[PDB]
Amino acid sequence: FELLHAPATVCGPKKSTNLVKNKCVNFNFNGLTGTGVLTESNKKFLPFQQFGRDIADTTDAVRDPQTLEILDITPCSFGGVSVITPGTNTSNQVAVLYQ
Amino acid sequence: FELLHAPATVCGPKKSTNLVKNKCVNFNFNGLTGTGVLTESNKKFLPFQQFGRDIADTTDAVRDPQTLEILDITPCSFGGVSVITPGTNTSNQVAVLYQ
């Protein structure tokens, strides 16, 4: 084994797995990591990109390394929870709200 | 190495160059690196010091030991640049303004 002479040329295996859809999970798309729902998109890519971006410079679309189908990345449902109460001096029933 | 406020005495044997005036250049006076245009100093003081400060705590005086002459350090040309332009849908001629 000889190092400190050239960049990376030969590496080892990667142990790829299957694909899931319609769920927000963490992914490793050739170095890109993030959480988002894997959904089929409508746009078309030229045959030399790997992933796309937006005005926020974040991950919104990616090309799978196994096939030629374009994917879309969107985060799932999240937000700050809100509460509605009449006060402890009047009643005890509460109405929880998702914003 | 001590960086006490004193004229420099010991450093390299590199030769010195001829004096230049009225040009914004970079000067090295006994280890004091600075940039600006060199002008004759109208200011004067008691002949027992080396160099002084100002309100901005910058370099405003020098007394090189080869020739006992007071020189003044002032900044050269500086400032922003602005453009006067009409609508680009009608014309492309612009103007250059210095502030």
Add this chain to the structure above:
Amino acid sequence: SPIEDLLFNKVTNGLTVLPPL
């Protein structure tokens, strides 16, 4: 009115945008 219609047509992660009340 057509005035507000014309006015509406004239004018145009981890972040949440609260809708107006």
Add this chain to the structure above:
Amino acid sequence: KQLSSKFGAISSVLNDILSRLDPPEAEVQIDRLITGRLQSLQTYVTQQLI
């Protein structure tokens, strides 16, 4: 008057540390200096805005 302070760095003059310190080793002192100067400029901007 606040610009010309050392801010805990090795040198106060901008071009003195550019020739006295190693250029690979000059990625900390001037970084802290410009961070503090950005803080001072930010609080000056807020005061001017108010």
Add this chain to the structure above:
Amino acid sequence: SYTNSFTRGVYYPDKVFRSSVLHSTQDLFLPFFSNVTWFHAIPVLPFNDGVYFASTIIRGWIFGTTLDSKTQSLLIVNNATNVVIKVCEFQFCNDPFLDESEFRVYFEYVSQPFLKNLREFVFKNIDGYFKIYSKHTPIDLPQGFSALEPLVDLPIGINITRFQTLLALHAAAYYVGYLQPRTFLLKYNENGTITDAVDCALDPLSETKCTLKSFTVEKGIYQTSNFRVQPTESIVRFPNITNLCPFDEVFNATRFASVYAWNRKRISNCVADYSVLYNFAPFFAFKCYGVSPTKLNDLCFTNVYADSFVIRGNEVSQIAPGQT
């Protein structure tokens, strides 16, 4: 001959997609309205950071540093059926060309070949990678905007100093450009293709369009940058003293005192020549904190004190600030 380049020198920075959003990238790009050489003499061509190539039959490229067997080099040949990329060292002719029965050009990678349409090539070599950009546009440099496409990349990890071309036979005309780093704004389409680019290093209006992320501007004053004069020359004045500071006395002394009885010597009012240091064997030292050991001649100071002692050897690094 001198030929002005109008629009050429535009390529994709990364393999990314943007939905018609302006983006600023600071990489190696060929500037607008820059003249390039029109070669017609049957030589040596200098190479710099980023080169633009163009031709109107003629194929082959020569790469290397000194064109000999003492350094690495690159060679690419794509005649009619396949392309080969050879990275090795070999004897290279002074005026190499091709004959199609004989070949007198004096690992391996094979890919698809690269075959009115004009041959446009941009060669870039940074960070030990060789990126190839090619495009053919059907229509003397062509008029109209065109965007190139990237090709495969091979991590050669070598250095390139000069480059040459090859003449294929079944002089000629070929264009050689030079690139310098600057900023550019690239506007994409909804298909994902670049359709409009502008430079911002030739006119103040271009700089105004550069900092607003749009090709359309309104009437008004837009502050973009500053105006400042550059220093044409430099001046240095050192103190007039020639006494040749006796550093050899404090260094090459016949005997030393103890560690707890160290002596102190003051050196001043002389000239310090920092060239006798290297005549004292290879060192386990010369790393310095708070001062640059490489830049030991430009700075001038005073109050020099030197002390001498001895160390066991297993605690050489113990003479350091912070280690107690």
